[PDB]
Curated annotation (Swiss-Prot):
Taxonomy of the source species: Eukaryota, Metazoa, Chordata, Craniata, Vertebrata
Annotated site, Sensor for electrophilic agents, chain positions: C114
Location of this chain's protein in the cell: Cytoplasm; Nucleus
Subunit record text: Component of the BCR(KEAP1) E3 ubiquitin ligase complex, at least composed of 2 molecules of CUL3, 2 molecules of KEAP1, and RBX1. Interacts with NFE2L2/NRF2; the interaction is direct. Forms a ternary complex with NFE2L2/NRF2 and PGAM5. Interacts with (phosphorylated) SQSTM1/p62; the interaction is direct and inactivates the BCR(KEAP1) complex by sequestering it in inclusion bodies, promoting its degradation. Interacts with NFE2L1. Interacts with BPTF and PTMA. Interacts with MAP1LC3B. Interacts indirectly with ENC1. Interacts with SESN1 and SESN2. Interacts with HSP90AA1 and HSP90AB1.
Effect of Y14A: Loss of interaction with NFE2L2/NRF2. Strongly reduces repression of NFE2L2/NRF2-dependent gene expression. Loss of interaction with PGAM5
Top-level lineage group: Eukaryota
Encoding gene, per UniProt annotation: KEAP1
Phenotypic consequence of R163A: Loss of interaction with NFE2L2/NRF2. Abolishes repression of NFE2L2/NRF2-dependent gene expression. Loss of interaction with PGAM5. Does not affect interaction with SQSTM1/p62
Name this protein carries in UniProt: Kelch-like ECH-associated protein 1
PTM sites of type S-cGMP-cysteine: C114
Length: 293
């Protein structure tokens, strides 16, 4: 499962306006590479990888001259250092969550102006097509998404009125969503990922405060348990897993757009500062793939 040469890629984000950056961090040597800018600035997007290709999904371009929610899907090839447009989603989705099952990208929730989506759609890379699947039971913007054992999980978010502690799971062979146990904490904008047999939710926003707490859902026991908290409170953070550890990148804490990156070791239940992004930002997309040629 592990292989040499993988980097943590961070795309887009927000600081004063939506950003076009693509930068890649190498845990083996501590370096950052600046790669080709996104074609369109975007914050509130999600990243993922299929077949060694990085995808940037959804978001919004908050710019000097407008706020435009994005239906775009764009693909970055590390081999060529080029972005290529793909077929767009059916609807713009800012503050989206994404997950990959069996080579297919699921785009979950998000907002379009005052519309809070519960809809969900699935992208087929070889065919370059999106199709709608069953909608979630709850409208969720700022939703955390992760995949474990070929099941898709949508965690927390904001329904337009309340921030959510609820979570739900999509069962592909039934094209059906079912609620799971609710989190201990209301979290909009949490970082959500999978590590071992658990879905982690780190940070986020409860409507009053950005959070440093972290909890994990054991898919067998159906319980949420707190683990050690991050050193820095943060919402709208990027997250990924690499070599058995969770990395959280940036975010917002009410005072600062963070450049902090923290790394969680589950065997010691400890967080450790690892590196700082080149500039503070929130609302990034993150994923891991092989280093650029
Ligand atoms: C000071 C202006 O800051 C801006 C302006 C424009 C864009 N981004 C920011 C930064 C920011 C401000 C507030 C926050 C809040 F903690 C926070 O998580 N919110 C949620 C949220 C979830 C996911 C994402 C990606 C963004 C925001 C939303 C759904 C909510 O629950 O309401 C988080 C980040």
């Amino acid at each position: 499962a592990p292989k040499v040469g993988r980097l943590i890629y961070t795309a887009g984000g927000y600081f004063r306006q939506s950003l076009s950056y693509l930068e890649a961090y190498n845990p083996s040597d501590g370096t950052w590479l600046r790669l080709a800018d996104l074609q369109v600035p975007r914050s509130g997007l999600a990243g993922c990888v299929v077949g060694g290709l990085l995808y940037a999904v959804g978001g919004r371009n908050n710019s000097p001259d407008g706020n435009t929610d994005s239906s775009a899907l764009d693909c970055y090839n590390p081999m060529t250092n080029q972005w290529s447009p793909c077929a767009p989603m059916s609807v713009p989705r800012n503050r989206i969550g994404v997950g990959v099952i069996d080579g297919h990208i699921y785009a979950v929730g998000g907002s379009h102006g005052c519309i809070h989506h519960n809809s969900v759609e699935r992208y087929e890379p070889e065919r370059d097509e999106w199709h709608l699947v069953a909608p979630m039971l709850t409208r969720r913007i700022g939703v955390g998404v992760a995949v474990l054992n070929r099941l898709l999980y949508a965690v927390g978010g904001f329904d337009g009125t309340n921030r959510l502690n609820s979570a739900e799971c999509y069962y592909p062979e039934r094209n059906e969503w079912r609620m799971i146990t609710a989190m201990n904490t209301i979290r909009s904008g949490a970082g959500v990922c999978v590590l071992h047999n658990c879905i982690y939710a780190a940070g986020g926003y409860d409507g009053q405060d950005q959070l440093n707490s972290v909890e994990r859902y054991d898919v067998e026991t159906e319980t949420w348990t707190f683990v050690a908290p991050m050193k820095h409170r943060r919402s709208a953070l990027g997250i990924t897993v690499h070599q058995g550890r969770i990395y959280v990148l940036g975010g917002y804490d009410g005072h600062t757009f963070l450049d902090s990156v923290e790394c969680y070791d589950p065997d010691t239940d400890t967080w450790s500062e690892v590196t700082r992004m080149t500039s503070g930002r929130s609302g990034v997309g993150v994923a891991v793939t092989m280093e650029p040629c």
